Design a protein around this ligand. Structure first.
Ligand SMILES: [Cl-]
Ligand SMILES: [Co+2]
Ligand SMILES: [Co+2]
Lengths: 326, 327
């Protein structure tokens, strides 16, 4: 293989850097190019009592499996000292900078995948930088028509029609167009990026009991149902819209490859209730592979090796499998 | 001290009648007063090959434990013949009548509790009667300020700040006054009906990540947090607002007596996921006790013998327990 991937620790004040140094303690079949501040990684390595060596990155020198206790650095400096667990609007642009280079590298083929660590939407915004999350950032920087967020544990896959939007904004966001792009990308990436010939997708309605014919909302009639029927006519195996609290039962889940929820808190609670903090946030529809953790920056954990690299490891392993699927 | 409860089978064309006939197959420590059409029950029993004897409801004579194979009937006639799995607008008024009669009996001490079978709102509305749900029907008829819907299992209790409303109406429904009313009722009933001295309540945020400090919505900061702080200062163990996708984990659930979700699909998916179907719907804040099944009318199973009475029996046992808890 001899493949290269780029990793972004995320918020410098968070436990992101910590997790990357922790996972660098083992060797990997691919080269781990970390786009961040070198001095940031060495300081955290020291405090954690973990050895760490950084190898200069270069698109010339061919990809080489990453040696244990080492990482390949793609330099980007902070704008002020980073204190473990101490957010600061100063390094805000730094975070977004690493995300840019990381995204660009994946858009230039020099990186086969992008695995992201946790970032803080707050510090970024408070820095005057418009930010929703990696998903929108990568979707916009790679001008993709539409990308789909999908959280998956070893037992359940849950995709979302909308990401991190205020509850009041969901209803208007769910348009025939969007719902069409979302399902198209999902059904496609499941057969190609996940090797599922005939993916069976359980679709959630927007309203409880899926609007119940208008008694609890009309969006199912005005948007959801029409779309699902069009796509079903195309052979797509879509079951819904169904009541979220009905389809989220073992009897339904055991006969489907993924579930598509209309919004964040409609499909994630169940996924998290049985994920064991090992879920991976996967972005579908991008020109390149992108996985990531789904936990926060855990500020009050930075400095002390307390953060669990479990999710980060799983996200990296998953991105690696997807790469093997060319 | 034999008590009386009233049971409304629900949609006559559905499986509610069947389920009541099934639970009647065993004896009960209370008198089961069924508010429904008697021929209907008898006819359904005959279809399921189950024996059944209807004893007339007599409020002038003391209540007596319901013997196996019998129900005490509070007659309400169907407007038209009932056909298994076939809705008929004609019997829409019948359903409502049984609900109004059962509700009134609980309001005047006739019955110690009310256990409701499933009803179909579509057939009721087409009959020209405004209907949204039992919860709203009882809240309105009881002239209660507010009621709170709760789905409970033996391991997890999920109360809702709002019931079956379109998602688009939620955000503005969560007002400071609504949160106060809902939490007040939840805390009180957990203590009185569930017998929990110091209720530990987990509160969900409205927006994902509980608004993420105001960067993903401001309702938590503007309404939710202010109300919770106020109530916490009064001794209420309120933990939240927390993101729904993180609080629904054993780590948090084990140290709690109930979770308060802001809306229906925020809390029920997890509850049902592990409810094993033995979940119970309880209305809190009413002048009387009321439990119910969590499933639909199952029109296709009506009169066929495959309806699961587990939820109804769990709903009835719970009601009996609350009657004891509030003696
Ligand atoms: Cl009346
Ligand atoms: Co999230
Ligand atoms: Co419901």
């Amino acid at each position: 293989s001899a493949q290269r991937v780029v990793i972004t620790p995320g918020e410098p004040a968070g436990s992101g850097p910590d997790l990357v140094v922790q996972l660098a303690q083992r060797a990997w079949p691919i080269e781990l190019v970390v786009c961040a501040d070198g001095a940031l990684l060495t300081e955290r390595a020291a405090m954690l009592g973990l050895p760490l060596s950084l190898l200069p990155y270069s698109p010339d020198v061919p990809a080489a499996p990453q040696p244990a206790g080492t990482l390949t650095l793609l330099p980007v400096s902070l704008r002020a000292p980073a204190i473990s667990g101490q957010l600061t609007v100063e390094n805000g642009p730094y975070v977004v900078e690493t995300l840019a280079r990381a995204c660009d590298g994946c858009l230039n083929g020099e990186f086969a995948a992008l695995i992201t660590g946790p970032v803080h939407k707050g510090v970024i915004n408070d820095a005057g930088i418009s930010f929703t999350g990696h998903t929108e950032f990568f979707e916009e920087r790679s001008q993709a028509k539409k990308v789909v967020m999908m959280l998956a544990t070893e037992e359940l896959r849950v995709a979302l029609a909308t990401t991190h939007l205020p509850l009041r904004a969901i209803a208007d966001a769910i348009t025939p167009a969007l719902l069409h792009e979302v399902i198209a990308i999902l059904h496609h990436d499941l057969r190609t990026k996940f090797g599922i010939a005939e993916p069976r997708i359980l679709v959630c309605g927007l309203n409880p009991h899926a609007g119940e014919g208008g008694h609890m909302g009309t969006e199912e009639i005005d948007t959801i149902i029409p779309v699902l029927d069009e796509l079903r006519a195309q052979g797509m195996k879509l079951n819904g819209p169904l009541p979220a609290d009905t389809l989220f039962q073992p009897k339904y889940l055991d006969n489907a490859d993924a579930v598509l929820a209309m919004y964040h808190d409609q499909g994630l609670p169940v996924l998290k209730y049985q994920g064991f903090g090992r879920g991976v946030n996967i972005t579908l529809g991008l020109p390149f592979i992108r996985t990531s953790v789904d936990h926060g920056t855990a500020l009050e954990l930075a400095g002390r090796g307390k953060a669990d690299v479990g999710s980060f490891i799983t996200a990296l392993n998953l991105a690696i499998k997807m790469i093997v699927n060319t």
